[PDB]
Amino acid sequence: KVFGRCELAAAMKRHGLDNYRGYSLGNWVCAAKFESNFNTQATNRNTDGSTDYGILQINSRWWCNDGRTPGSRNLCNIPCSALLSSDITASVNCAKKIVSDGNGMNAWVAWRNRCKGTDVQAWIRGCRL
């Protein structure tokens, strides 16, 4: 599913991401835009042989099981393919676990490089929320 900006903000709000660990909603929308272009089916292979999956590009080295990442962990306890569904429940719950882990949203390279320190409110401007 390719989400619309406002449609994604509303699903993110419903699942309790707005101000989760102090990250306002526009942070999560902005991270989604640059990680997956709002596409729940996006996959990207990393140099280390791990793969990122879904709307928040959650990585198979720590967070989900894809059966092909030697010696990885599965801390969100899910097959990585669960992260590609048009329902984002699995991605959001897993993201709550990641963002609590110590580095906050710096865990998302595109967030650190493209969203951090910018006017992230712009990402939810005009949304009926």
Phi, psi of 10, rounded to the nearest 5 degrees: -65, -40
Q: Which is nearer to Na ion, 26 or 54 (CB)?
A: 26
Which residue's Cβ lies closest to Cl ion? 104
Give CA separation, 79 vs 8, 53, 58, 96, in Å: 22, 10, 11, 17
Q: Is 26 in the site for Na ion (CB under 5 A)?
A: yes
Among 121, 122, 125, 129, binds Na ion (CB under 5 A): 121
User: Rounded distance, CA 119 to CA 94, Å?
Assistant: 25
Active site residue 18: no
User: Rounded distance, CA 42 to CA 91, Å?
Assistant: 13
Q: Which of 18, 52, 66, 119 is catalytic?
A: 52
Phi, psi of 121, rounded to the nearest 5 degrees: -50, -40
Q: Is 101 annotated as a binding residue?
A: yes
Q: Which is nearer to Na ion, 106 or 118 (CB)?
A: 118
Active site residue 48: no
User: Rounded distance, CA 113 to CA 123, Å?
Assistant: 16
Subset of 48-107 contacting Cl ion (CB under 5 A): 104
For residues 13 and 50, the answer to whether their CB atoms sit within 8 Å is no
- The catalytic site residues sit at 35, 52
Question: Which residues are at the interface with Cl ion (CB under 5 A)?
Answer: 104
List, as residue ranges, the binding site for substrate: 101
Question: Which residues are at the interface with Na ion (CB under 5 A)?
Answer: 24-26, 69, 72, 121
